[PDB]
């Protein structure tokens, strides 16, 4: 009975940690897509100014 209670607690904890890692990876991917989008928008504005001159 003791080992079984302890093993269930271990399994819950590990699943929790896997979900946390997934959320952290999603946050990272959202920031990288956002930053890259910002760089592209900035690049395009600058090229248009050069075309204008």
């Amino acid at each position: 009975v003791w080992l079984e209670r302890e093993e269930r607690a271990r399994q819950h904890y590990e699943k929790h940690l896997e979900e946390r890692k997934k959320r952290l990876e999603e946050q990272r991917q959202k920031e990288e897509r956002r930053r890259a989008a910002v760089e592209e928008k900035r690049r395009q504005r600058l090229e248009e100014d050069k075309e204008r001159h």
Binding site: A9, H12, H16
Partner: peptide, 14 residues
């Protein structure tokens, strides 16, 4: 109101 509950859940306590 589940005050402070997440502090225990985050440690593996279902």
């Amino acid at each position: 109101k589940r005050a402070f509950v997440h502090w225990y859940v985050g440690e593996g306590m279902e």
